[PDB]
Amino acid sequence: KVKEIRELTTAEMLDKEKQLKEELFNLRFQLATGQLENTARIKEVRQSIARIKTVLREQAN
Template sequence: MLDQEKQLKEELFNLRFQLATGQLENTARIKEVRKSIARIKTVLHEQADK
């Protein structure tokens, strides 16, 4: 899970960089990645509470 979160954060960074340089074609991907990160963080938080 932590590896997946790290990969998604890197992807989000790259997407934001592409957005700033005008190279990003699929802007909806940013929203998808952000939601995926939030889902992973939620699961990790729930597991930590147990």
């Protein structure tokens, strides 16, 4: 959801950031080659990256 993000330190924040990046790259490729039953995840990953970034923003000033 939203609250589990607030628990982790800045290290885990950047970790999950890079992990979501990689997942987005894989979703991108597997789009072009006729796959990905559940395409509604291409929203979730971008929105989660957004949430992580803003929550990071509010802490660092």
